[PDB]
Design a protein around this ligand. Structure first.
Ligand SMILES: O=C(O)[C@H]1CN[C@H](O)[C@@H](O)[C@H]1O
Ligand SMILES: O=C(O)[C@H]1CN[C@H](O)[C@@H](O)[C@H]1O
Lengths: 595, 593
């Protein structure tokens, strides 16, 4: 389904619906029955949008709730939008949302992390107030991405189980907006940027969907039109192009114009002229080997759960720049698109990942066979392929995105894993031939055990030697780590990114014994992993788990959450922060370090 | 001087300008000479609006920067706005803003904490993109509210010094926005809300400033019209009284009719009255007992920046702990907080940025009230600060009292003659609510001169902390003795507007000694036992709701640690001690004995 990022243009207006909404639980599950969307939510309180609903109220009972919740506000449609295509859009509703404009149901979506939107024109009058009601469901089952099991106790009270290591935050996490186009409008663009080997010339393929004649012009940073073309498709030539390079991010603008006899639409699409290719064991960007540094992240912070926030984005990017990070992965769900707009503009390299985590009952009563009709089945695979389609639909034109991760840490031991994953790998490549693909690999599915990694282009490993196994023993951990990395190099001859390596670290726990949970062990352990990486030629990246401490469901393994942060959840540095800064700022930009 | 909260109506639209702006420092103070507003800011970076610029970048050199900073962004004016009045409004810029539209200067403001707007219709074209540049200055001198002193070191690099115990956060802390009116518009409203002793009747006065034919209607909560007029009084049988802890709201719709154009503006109204009666604070002719906090506009990363989730959460916590009230220590808060307190029936002491009129808290002018310090030109700004606050909040039923200064020194030469003209000029700017002045720790019953000019006595006390340190026994006697001495002197209502001790979350002690969680509990306990045994005390506002940032010093362990909650909003044991007292008692009534 076509999904361009709304942008204000001579032909296009946006009105944000972010702010205080009315909010109500639905403990009874009668809000659909009683059509709660007809009148004011009856027992309601104020809530911030965007935000997770769970932590806004300092209330355990709302935090831990499973079921439906209701959001509602009134909004004036701009007078002067009369005779315009009016769209209502939600950047994200976690995990499921149904929307009513007054009494007309207009939208339904499953998938907590990518946008959905409807033509609401026939259900609103320009200059009049409208009521927008949302039913938001946070329940996971074997056909949701990610999967889960609702457990219903003898009293019929629901309790979400899930297999991923981060809290099941829900609500309207990202901006809600009414926006306009002319009734003739550009509905979809696809740009591919080819780059010659000598880097001295580049072609830009375009493809456009719009109910009118299409023209495009390519403008550089100085606004100088550098190329033009006509019709739904073609190829712009660019001599001596300003390449989009990691650390710089030079953007052109592709102005696409949809022109009927009466009216016209204008969409500016930012373009980074760059190519991305695996070549043996090297990850090439503009024909030059790249070395990833930086983090697995999460969309997580105090009070707002996974809600988008501009101060948080500005602050975290200052921290990643300070520390010398050149890259990250959207672990483990599509991130707010303003993150990909920031990366495009600042030349930050991103591994874009789906919400497909938790396909693994072995990370600790769960179904006996992971790949079966009672768990991951043909429906689950369909839901997964849909998850992949929406992510690529959103993110295909972000030059910051260099690789698709279609899943995180699935159990690949069973016969079934390869039957499930092979067609998803093939479909992903069809949806976007321009980027390499990966499936992030769990520690127990080692080089000798794993049955799917040959189907993907880049080997993305999550390794905790010296933490979950060889606990506290850097000596034995180093031998085991180096042995396995070389066994993967021999097995597949792919580029290897260590997408996770980290240890829980209590900020302020200090030890002369350099033992587990201390700041000092975090430092020694990352240091050991770095020496190993620098001795294996197939290793082309290191992404520390995690940028910051983050919330998980409660358990004996999590001291108030996951403490593998380099920074605390309030973004204060642990000692290891200064260790990463030395290594990452001390290396040459984008180049594998040396002994 | 006319300040109406922009709200959307059939005749009034709004576009928020909040989001990422371009941002630059101006170390070389050459921005105005090079007229930076004429081009895109050079060597800029993204900043979030709203929020302080100081903590967004984890960079000490920006955090501590003194001088001018530049914000810039482009924005499309909506096509349907052609032939309407286009305003540009900043809800707050700390401490000074000057604003250009393309190449045209449109406004200036001094005052970190209140709105300012210009009609920009002539310099914008609906359906075109225009560039908004803002030069924001964070410097404080003896004429700014609040005061400080700038030192230019050996290289022209400024270094700011100030006399208040909260960090000097600056930037565009609140919403920026374009909004429309018809060329005929409502431009101002005042509303007074008399309530007969019986309570079973009430009358609402209304004045309006509009360049067209004024008509008003007052609807109740269910949108049933309940009065009408064409200046005037509306009458109301068995009125729904705005009551603490409920906050019933009516809507005064105010129409401004030309033959050509019409303008509607709804204004929420709470039918309540507030007066002192001897030793009692009275709302709707009932004795009230204030509980809750001195607060701050302070949080991780965003500084004093307004945030929706933070507002929703902090209110959630106050609710849970049983707070009915707070003070806007020590500056006007974001209007949203008062729109909130209006709806939920929270009581608010609304306070000016006038704090640190003092040189003895914890090189500088040897005479506080002099030409080289707090002079007549200072008294003026202070009056201008009092004007702008009442111009914005005169209509909020939550605002139960004005606070015209916090912790002014009262010993130096000619305190009274400085303040007498301000307490007068306050009651003339609005006589509907009592006024107060917050009374610093060392300015005791004998020392203070000024208390007599004000309706309610607001004490900040710290016995057992800054004095009689860690001795709760000696601290109790000295506190009781002093609150009785204050009864005898003024027979006014006594609110403790600050009582708090620095408490390091996780510091546990068997010896119940200073900085421990246990000390915070045993000490608030003692202030509590005294409060109850003194008929004159009609309020207790704990200092502070949460840990907040200060300037660096030997007295501040990473900031002020007097919070009941940490900066990340986690409770200390004292959160549970206050929750028993404040919810175990009766809404708005002093406890027994
Ligand atoms: O902390 C950990 O152990 C890691 C393990 N690997 C998963 O991909 C992460 O979600 C996180 O749970
Ligand atoms: O923490 C303190 O000591 C208090 C004393 N009184 C002031 O009004 C507050 O701003 C704060 O400095």
């Amino acid at each position: 389904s076509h999904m361009l990022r709304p942008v204000e243009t001579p032909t296009r207006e946006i009105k944000k619906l972010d702010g205080l909404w009315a909010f109500s639980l639905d403990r009874e599950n009668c809000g659909i029955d009683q059509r709660w969307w007809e009148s004011a939510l009856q027992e309601s309180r104020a809530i911030a949008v965007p935000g997770s609903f769970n932590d806004q109220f300092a209330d355990a009972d709302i935090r831990n709730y499973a079921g439906n919740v209701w959001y509602q506000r009134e909004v004036f449609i701009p007078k002067g939008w009369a005779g315009q295509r009016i769209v209502l859009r939600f950047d994200a509703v976690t995990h499921y949302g149904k929307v009513w404009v007054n009494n007309q149901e207009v939208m339904e979506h499953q998938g907590g992390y990518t946008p959905f939107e409807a033509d609401v024109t026939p259900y609103v009058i320009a200059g009049k107030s409208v009521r927008i009601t949302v039913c938001v469901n946070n329940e996971l089952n074997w056909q949701t991405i990610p999967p889960g099991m609702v457990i219903t106790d003898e009293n019929g009270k629901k309790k979400q189980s899930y297999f991923h290591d981060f809290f099941n935050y829900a609500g309207i996490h990202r901006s809600v907006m009414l926006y306009t186009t002319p009734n003739t409008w550009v509905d979809d663009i696809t740009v591919v940027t080819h780059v010659a080997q000598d880097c001295n010339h580049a072609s830009v393929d375009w493809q456009v969907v719009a109910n009118g004649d299409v023209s495009v012009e390519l403008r550089d940073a100085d606004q100088q039109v550098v190329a033009t073309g006509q019709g739904t498709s073609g190829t712009l030539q660019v001599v001596n192009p300003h390449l989009w390079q990691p650390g710089e991010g030079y953007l052109y603008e592709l102005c696409v114009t949809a022109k009927s006899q009466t009216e016209c639409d204008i969409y500016p699409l930012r373009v980074g002229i760059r190519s991305v290719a695996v070549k043996g064991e090297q990850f090439l960007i503009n024909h030059k080997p790249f070395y990833f540094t930086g983090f697995g992240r999460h969309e997580d912070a105090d009070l707002r759960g996974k809600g988008f926030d501009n101060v948080l984005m500005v602050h975290d990017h200052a921290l990643m720049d300070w520390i010398g990070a050149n890259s990250y992965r959207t672990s483990h769900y599509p991130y707010a698109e303003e993150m990909l707009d920031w990366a495009d503009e600042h030349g930050i390299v991103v591994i874009d990942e789906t919400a497909a985590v938790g396909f693994n009952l072995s990370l600790g009563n769960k179904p006996k066979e992971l790949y079966s009709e009672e768990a991951v089945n043909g429906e689950t695979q369909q839901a997964h392929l849909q998850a992949i389609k929406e992510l690529i639909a959103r993110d295909k034109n972000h030059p910051s995105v260099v690789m698709w991760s279609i899943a995180n840490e699935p159990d690949t031991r069973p016969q079934g894993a390869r039957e499930y994953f092979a067609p998803l790998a093939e479909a992903t490549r069809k949806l976007d031939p321009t980027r390499p693909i990966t499936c992030v690999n769990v520690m127990f599915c080692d080089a000798h055990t794993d049955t799917i990694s040959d189907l993907f282009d880049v080997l993305c490993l999550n390794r905790y030697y010296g933490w979950y196994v060889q606990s506290g023993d850097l000596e034995t951990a180093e031998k085991v780590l180096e042995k396995e990395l070389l066994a993967w190099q021999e097995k597949l001859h792919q580029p290897i990114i260590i997408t996770e390596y980290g240890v829980d670290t209590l900020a302020g726990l200090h030890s002369m014994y350099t033992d587990m949970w201390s700041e000092e062990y975090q430092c020694a352990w990352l240091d050991m992993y770095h020496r190993v990486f620098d001795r294996v030629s197939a290793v082309v990246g290191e992404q520390v788990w995690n940028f910051a401490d983050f919330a998980t469901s409660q358990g004996i393994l999590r001291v108030g959450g996951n403490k593998k942060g380099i920074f605390t959840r309030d973004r204060k540095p642990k000692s290891a922060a200064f260790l990463l800064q030395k290594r990452w700022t001390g290396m040459n930009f984008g180049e594998k370090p040396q002994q």
